[PDB]
């Protein structure tokens, strides 16, 4: 090969995505999580915000590890699975409520 | 339609990182000093946002990852507790 020009746009798309990500992160972190929870009364709404927070951090850690050139994504993949597990419990709970 | 911009943005980053990772980045990173640099900056940019999330919660590599496992554990327990309480109130 020796041709880097093909590799560069991959990065640009990545950087573009990161810039796009920042404002959203600032919105999320505009208040501490605990302060956000207080601003909620619905237990359901609370569970949602938390699962979301777990999702973003895990994903951002995942993306980090990929770019680092980490071969093995299993520790993050394992944690990501665990998060899905808890997100799954949230939904099945909803179904139980619906039937109720 | 309640669409989540944040989650959509998060996914774009993962795709972008992943797509980036598929290339022989190590080959170019080692080949070109200029490339290595920007790349670290973008990763740091990604790193900055992730630590900001951690700063929001506020509850050596070995020593480091261990620390990450600890935060995920903190988040997931709050969640389990939230779930346990809904299940209890129903029951």
């Amino acid at each position: 090969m020796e041709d880097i020009e093909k590799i560069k746009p991959y990065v640009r798309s990545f950087s573009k995505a990161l810039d796009e990500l920042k404002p959203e992160i600032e919105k999320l972190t505009s208040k501490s999580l605990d302060e956000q929870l207080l601003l909620l009364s619905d237990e359901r709404a609370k569970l949602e915000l938390i699962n979301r927070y777990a999702y973003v951090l895990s994903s951002l850690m995942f993306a980090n590890m990929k770019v680092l050139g980490v071969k093995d994504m299993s520790p993050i993949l394992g944690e990501l699975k665990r998060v899905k597990s808890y997100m799954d419990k949230a939904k099945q709970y909803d179904n139980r409520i619906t039937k109720s | 339609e309640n669409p989540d911009v944040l989650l959509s943005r998060v996914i774009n980053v993962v795709r972008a990182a992943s797509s980036l990772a598929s290339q022989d980045v190590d080959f170019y990173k080692n080949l070109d000093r200029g490339f290595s640099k920007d790349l670290k900056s973008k990763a740091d940019k990604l790193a900055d946002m992730a630590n900001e999330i951690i700063l929001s919660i506020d509850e050596d590599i070995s020593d480091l990852w261990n620390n990450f496992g600890n935060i995920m554990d903190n988040l997931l327990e709050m969640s389990d507790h939230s779930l346990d309480k809904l299940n209890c109130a129903i029951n």
């Binding site: 093909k6 999702y55 994903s59 990501l80 | 996914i11 598929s22």
Partner: peptide, 14 residues
């Protein structure tokens, strides 16, 4: 739709 699919899917490498 599943959010986690993004982890599995293959990149658009040249």
């Amino acid at each position: 739709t599943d959010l986690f699919d993004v982890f599995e899917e293959t990149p658009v490498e040249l």
